């Protein structure tokens, strides 16, 4: 029983996180193998940033412009090369440590785990969700950037995100590892803001249905609604349309407490159209929508 | 910018996990140097809980009916021994992953990360509070018990929880790495129950300043208040005492933000009375108390968004 936000056990990526410096700069990198991936913007100075030309930045570097640091021992950079945002040193040591892999891009909606680093050094772990806008509710300060996002799927770490900066609401934005961004970001010091965010609704569905299996059970109601008039209601209150693919992915969780997902909808209706009544569901005051389907089974089910 | 619970990198607890059989209970086990930690009811039947006599139970066992098993290798389990309400197994492997490491028990109100795991595999990380009634509100299915709870302030991981059992409210009961209960809680089954709980006063004042810290002043107030009129009015509300101790403890808060702390606490007293209008602090519509003040300093800017 009880029902938490909880982030994967980090092992497998604290082995893989280095320091990068280049000139003043310094940040994260990821150590897989024999190449370390950052930020391609640690090439950059101030200046640059207001417009850079990083096709060019990069000719001006040399491999001996890198420093790259695994603890307390100085990898040497042998290569250097970008895809996309993501600047790649080859190094002249394989990370030992080095897990099964796979780089993944992740959808707006999907949770994943943050490994949180400063100067190489792993900090913190805690758990965040692509919003609907792109950016993610982090917590990163200055010298976070490369810090990485993952889920793991048996053995295999799936890397997803690479932290690259901050916009002015104090949200962040970054790359998937082949350095493509998450929204319509670019790593370039120009006006960039969020745009106006959404609420994840079958989240929200998966984590009344992780309040079913948890015991608290007040929103139920004798009402059912159709998929149309949910959608409806959830563009009102500036939710996401929840699809027929949707009510699949909630299939388990529907299965598991008996409750049909648009007899499920209904209580979301009502909720959105009276409030909670002074009344909390696990705990919360608001509706949570970070939590995926998948997260709420693989926690109500004890998956390692 | 951003403010969310965070917890310890969990590698170096990973790497002590394994799993622990008598009989047909597995649950978990902490390996350090040639020592297996777990809890002594994996000793126990179902019909042994109501009324153990755990001395009894364990002189009947051997060395032999205990199983540990660390990823797809099995120890070999050369002694036992209990101590208070954790049983020890000594193994014939050292673990060469173990780190630096101590035992700490630690005092209602401190936070720690937990390593939940199932059959010695780790499956998540999480922070948790030890409540004022010696409880904590995790997420534990059957088979967790054994999990660990930690911090690693400094590279050195502090040991300061291992899970026992769930109670009727569905909070959780264990001890510290020496085997004594947090609370009043027995490894049996009685009609125990979790006390009403309470808000933990200093870290909801360590929140208010973390919101501080990160840009955010509407909660504040012309207002002070002596320390006894603060805690006469939030006991009213189930909140924990204030101490001078906890007044101390919030000081560097107090100084990288430039309010007195009695002074934040003219403000959560006016929060308690008002409410929130709609509004959300560090994105929650309720006073969060599982951030303590050494947690905020470790998370948030040193540098006031003024
Ligand atoms: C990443 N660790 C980090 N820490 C601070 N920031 C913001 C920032 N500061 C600089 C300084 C220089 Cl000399 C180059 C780049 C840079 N950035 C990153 C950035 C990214 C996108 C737009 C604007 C700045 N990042
Ligand atoms: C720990 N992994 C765990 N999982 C389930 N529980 C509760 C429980 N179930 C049993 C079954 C048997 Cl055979 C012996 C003991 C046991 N316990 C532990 C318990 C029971 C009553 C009070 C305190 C602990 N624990
Ligand atoms: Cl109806
Ligand atoms: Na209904």
Redesign the pocket.
Known sequence: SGFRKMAFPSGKVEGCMVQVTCG?????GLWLDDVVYC?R??I???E??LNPNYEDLLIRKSNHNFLVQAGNVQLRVIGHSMQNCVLKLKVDTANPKTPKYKFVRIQPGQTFSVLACYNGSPSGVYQCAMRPNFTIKGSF??????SVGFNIDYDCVSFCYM????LPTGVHAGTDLEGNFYGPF?????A?AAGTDTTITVNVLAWLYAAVINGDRWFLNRFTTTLNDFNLVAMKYNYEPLTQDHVDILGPLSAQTGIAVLDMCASLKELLQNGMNGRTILGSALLEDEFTPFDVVRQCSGVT
Request: some cysteine.
């Open positions: 003043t700069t310094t940040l994260n930020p913007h640690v950059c100075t101030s640059d940033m300060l200055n010298g976070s950037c490369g932290h690259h900066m901050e670019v790593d370039r010091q120009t960039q």
